[PDB]
Symmetry: C3
Subunit: 262 residues, 3 copies
């Protein structure tokens, strides 16, 4: 039962942070690890693994920590690192962090990730707001009778607030694939034909779960590389992390400022 698991996790979060309720939750993805400090000074930092239902993150660049940080007038839950479907876990565990955050009081989820850029105007190191997504996993974190509407899944309101922080920000459609292998050039051309501007291996299910649980979502992708075949250069996870690190300053600053505007 996802509901009870989330409640139990939320209770532990309240007991360890000393805060009965949090207002916003942020998940830092690949390349986003160094952006955690700019969010503010944490009042609590603990291992995600400590929390009920939390499968510890294992991918490089994912700290696997939970931080409670005051940002603006909000108490923010920072999920430094996430698990992915390609790691083999049931989607119940993949979306648990977001559900636990919701049970802890968070009504706004800021989901960040690294992504390959498909639209010609996107450059490596550029943060892109997610306007919508393409779930190409043939799966759903929802089960039986949960008919959730995904119109405005990525709140236009939150994207406008983000632009208030940095009017420069572009938007794009995120394609969520299973992974863990990167795409072939032909698959990238296919994704372009399908309307995708960004490609990654997470987020879509978490967004679906967040909406199903009544929370708004702000998605932010960091273009860590141009999609396969666009340049012809080889992609590697280390390169993804390195690319993300180069924009850590802007990223951390952006998150801190936008969240304060919520």
């Amino acid at each position: 039962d996802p509901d009870e698991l989330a409640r139990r996790a939320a209770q532990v979060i309240a007991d360890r942070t000393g805060i009965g309720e949090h207002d916003v939750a942020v998940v830092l993805g690949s390349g986003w690890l160094p952006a955690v400090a700019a969010l503010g000074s944490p009042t609590t930092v603990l291992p995600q693994a400590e929390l009920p239902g939390f499968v510890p993150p294992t991918a490089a660049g994912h700290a696997g920590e939970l931080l409670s940080v005051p940002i603006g007038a909000h108490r923010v839950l920072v999920l430094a690192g996430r698990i992915h479907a390609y790691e083999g876990h049931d989607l119940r565990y993949v979306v648990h962090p977001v559900r636990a955050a919701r049970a802890a009081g968070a009504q706004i989820m800021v989901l960040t990730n690294a992504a390959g850029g498909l639209r010609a105007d996107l450059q490596v190191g550029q943060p892109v707001l997610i306007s919508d997504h393409l779930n190409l996993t043939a799966r759903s974190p929802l089960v039986g009778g949960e008919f959730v509407d995904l119109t405005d899944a990525y709140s236009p309101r939150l994207r406008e607030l983000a632009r208030q922080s940095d009017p420069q920000l572009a938007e794009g459609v995120y394609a969520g694939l299973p992974g863990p292998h990167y795409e072939t050039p032909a698959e990238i051309r296919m994704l372009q034909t399908l309307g995708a501007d960004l490609v990654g291996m997470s987020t879509v299910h978490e967004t679906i779960a967040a909406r199903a649980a009544g929370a708004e979502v702000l998605g932010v992708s960091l273009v860590t590389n141009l999609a396969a075949g666009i340049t012809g250069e080889p992609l590697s996870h280390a390169e993804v992390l390195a690319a993300g690190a180069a924009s850590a300053t802007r990223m951390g600053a952006l998150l801190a400022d936008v969240i304060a505007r919520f």
Copy 2:
């Protein structure tokens, strides 16, 4: 064993209805529940849960009953309600009803469903004959060695008979997705590029199983809403059922008239 479980179901059906063999089978989908009255008067009504191999339907608007109704010169098996892949059951259970119907003698399957409309001409409340489908579930109810040809999976002959009943009936390509979450506007634009005119969360596997079993198929979608992003308005299951109810009488009358022409 699928075949043997289908035979057991067909036998219980014969015993309970007192009819040794049926000629046509109809599966009523979301919103079609109240269309049963217009089909004719049942000689027998029983719970699907009482039939071997039948996983009971659980989605709202799915009665989970089996009726034996005489329509014209045919003895018709009416499967009021169905189970869906999003309910978590293996496909053998999802296509079992159709296989049991075939074992009961049904050589024609009338698969009805609710669907979101993507093509510009479609209106809410409009019945649409399925001309072909797009299986976007990445699954199949068939196993090794079952290399079934899907050309004319939706019998042109039956669509021809349907138009004889209502000359104004339009046709469309149905895209079958996993569900249970509705599609994002971006996914809808993607489906239009893929050639989809209607979008749903059932039917495709049942059609495949029916063809593999040697039965002809007539697919009928009731546009219960325009696809996500077309109107921007929210989608909800209650609304799907409500829309279906507004057209239930017409749908039942249509089915009765078409089937009598078989």
Copy 3:
């Protein structure tokens, strides 16, 4: 563990063939069974079922044997027949043959298969080099941390060598689907829009596993039929095998000559 099972299978291969190491591996797919003779005179022939981790092939036209054949200056492992995902096995077993071959020393994998033709200039009986693929199975044979780059997954270098044998060889993008049901005409139109020139039910995962393991790949499809909807004619596995048999002479000769050029 996949790697351990692979190394173990490789030790058995070495022992039963008396050959401590092989240089090239070739997988013969549907319709390719008779092309084995032209490869050369085998020094050892044994059932795949007798090797660790090898699930026996079951589809008609797949011998299920492993042959050690000297071709040119190379010691070649010939996998006569393969298993498919539609047979229900975990992808670990589907890609095991390739991983075992790599562990046995093979740094080049020649993956052959039967495929439906989508591009208008491709004819039944025509061999087509795979330039790239579209993995439309929503799956991957890899697990967490195995972020493999798939640029040039099908070695341009090996395709060049292939053309030195037959300068008239055409290239095409292969779409890998789950199967086992054949595609609907609407699905074929979709595949064309997605950039597919060939459609099949294997190879993509084996290619991914090969690349992840450090082996180059040469993919060769034999157009055994025009895709569904192109002609309207019925498709069947027997016809696929018959079509393949009609070009077995050309294929066996092609394989023997190309491998000798490696």
